[PDB]
Amino acid sequence: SKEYHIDEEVGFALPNPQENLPDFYNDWMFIAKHLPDLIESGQLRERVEKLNMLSIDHLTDHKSQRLARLVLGCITMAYVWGKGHGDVRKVLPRNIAVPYCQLSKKLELPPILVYADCVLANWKKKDPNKPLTYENMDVLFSFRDGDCSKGFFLVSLLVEIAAASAIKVIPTVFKAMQMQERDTLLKALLEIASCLEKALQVFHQIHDHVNPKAFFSVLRIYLSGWKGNPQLSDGLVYEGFWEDPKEFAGGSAGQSSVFQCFDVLLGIQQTAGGGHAAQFLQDMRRYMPPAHRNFLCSLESNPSVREFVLSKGDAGLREAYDACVKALVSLRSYHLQIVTKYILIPASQTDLMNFLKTVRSTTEKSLLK
């Protein structure tokens, strides 16, 4: 629906995002569009510091506002991390922080790049008459020449969109349970499983478009945040807007609404327990667009799909429920392999692994089998 801002084609992603801002913001667009060149040449922080505080009043519709969040969030990452070898900035100039925070509070997101910026809104179709394929798609922004940002962000999105195809089946699952349509429920659960099975196959493209050295040594620097970060132990002064510095976490697929919503749908209690894994995924919901955050708590309001299947003594239903759980297990298992190639191996030339393995365990132990 439109009350939750879920598109029938791309789900939680922003459909056909805006590429251009009103000419009044050209001084933003130029820095954002040339971050690689400007960083390399020691001129990024300069060009930022020479900016005039612009007003967000000319950002009239949602898409224009989302684009500027992406522009300003990428500038902020560039400004704070600089060249990504340690010369850090801990105060962000008012000429940029003030419009950023005002545009942020209006869209109900923290003033920091989030998944919904750099994946869900950081894309375009090359030719609009051709479909959503990697070859028909590009990102809007990058940080460095060679950072594989187009590969990482686009493959992330294409997996999102693949998994997104199961979202339209959630209403039928809940109506089938309510009106006791056993065979309809079963068909719906297998269609959802089928969708999470394609999402895995899409994920395979990551290897052609991302390389480990670039992800580990470049891209991950610019996706990092300032929450529990020793390089900014107290957070980031948003000059002109907040007195004391604030801590906000970096971009994460933990901020994706598709995967969190299938854990909810299936009663995989990712956000229960009180433990570190659950608390993290709960926190990451505040880094989501408000309608998407609301979608998820609305799913939790609904009768448990798991408890209904469990109580029914129906092997066919249980195999279908498990076909969905299994697909998440498979997805998460593949992801652990990818995390070995792109983080763990390069780093030899963690709390990460324990977090992912706890989420994957909770998923596997949800199987009925």
Ligand code: HEM
């Ligand atoms: C080079 C590729 C990738 C790397 C190195 C990577 C790495 C990581 C790491 C280290 C985490 C845990 C830390 C954190 O949350 O910040 C994580 C979480 C997560 N990643 Fe990735 N990721 C990659 C691509 C993807 C893709 C393509 C997807 C999904 C389509 C994905 C889905 C997730 C999800 C859903 C989580 C949250 C926990 C979970 O639900 O299992 N990642 N990723």
Ligand SMILES: O[C@H]1CCCC[C@@H]1CNc1cc(Br)cc2[nH]ncc12
């Ligand atoms: O683990 C973190 C280490 C440093 C900060 C960024 C790294 C993970 N962030 C991600 C961002 C986006 Br966008 C998408 C993602 N999918 N999976 C992980 C991830």
